[PDB]
């Protein structure tokens, strides 16, 4: 902005776009999503082989698979050999834990 | 509760998941349930926007709050400080083994 | 064949089409091959999200499971509430009960 100029759209735009690229983690785990062309393409095949009635339920499966090994990337580039313990993992290792004490 | 309460309802159980917390595949399938209402809804506050700012703001909010991989892992992003909050909950236990091993 | 006349390849062809229609058994599993279409399309989604290196087992585990359900098909169209015991079932039934009877 400049006293007598008068502030556009498109500077007021990526100026918001500098705040949500501050959303994105600078660390992050590369939770896959399941694309459509991907979900139905797997369900028409399964439909295919006469699996319709499991064919919804063969794509979790396959959304599952993804989401189980899902990788950790820091620039968009996979961070190699990261390890990570979630907290649900380790809030079995506290209740296990708990569980020697108490007994 | 009020991070779970736009996923689960008013009805949370709380308890369910403060004793085993959600997986990070888990996290995923909730975003991904409410994924579809979540656009339709950014897109009618998109369209009762006082200004067009407002309403490029919305649909920039949502488009990254929408990916679950923008989802903010604290064992991700800090890995040593997510070993030392479990070893915090630990130590508390070590010392309550202690007291029994010397009795 | 007449007697005047000359058989075409035409004519062999489809004598030889209805062989083969016989080696194609009454009532069959309809064991699913995955196209690579469909079998690309997932790789490449795998790769989309850093995946890359277990890319294939990821198909594989797409391919097993629409081949563990595999269903039960007699002209073409499903046969509904087919139950069947295979010889590997058969055979850990038979391995158990000898193991009952020599113990």
Redesign the interface.
């Known amino acids: 902005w400049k006293k007598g100029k008068t502030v556009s759209i498109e500077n007021l735009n990526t100026v918001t776009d500098k705040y949500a690229a501050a959303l994105v983690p600078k660390r992050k785990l590369a939770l896959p999503v399941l694309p459509e062309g991907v979900k139905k393409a797997v369900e028409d095949f399964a439909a295919s082989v006469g699996q319709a009635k499991n064919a919804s339920e063969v794509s979790e499966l396959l959304a599952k698979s993804l989401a189980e090994k899902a990788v950790v990337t820091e620039g968009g580039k996979v961070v190699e050999g990261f390890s990570y313990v979630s907290k649900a993992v380790a809030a079995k290792v506290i209740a296990t834990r708990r569980a020697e004490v108490h007994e | 509760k009020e991070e779970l309460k736009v996923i689960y309802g008013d009805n949370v159980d709380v308890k369910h998941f403060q ?11 909730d975003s ?1 349930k409410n994924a579809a209402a979540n656009k339709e809804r950014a897109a009618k506050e998109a369209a009762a926007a006082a200004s ?2 407002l309403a ?2 919305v649909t ?2 949502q ?3 929408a ?11 800090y ?1 040593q400080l ?2 030392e ?2 070893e915090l ?2 130590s508390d ?1 070590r010392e ?2 202690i007291a ?1 091993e010397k009795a």
């Open positions: 004793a085993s917390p959600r997986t990070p595949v888990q996290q995923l399938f991904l067009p700012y490029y703001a920039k909010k488009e990254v709050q990916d679950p991989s923008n989802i903010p892992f604290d064992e991700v992003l890995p997510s070993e909050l479990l909950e630990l236990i309550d083994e029994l």
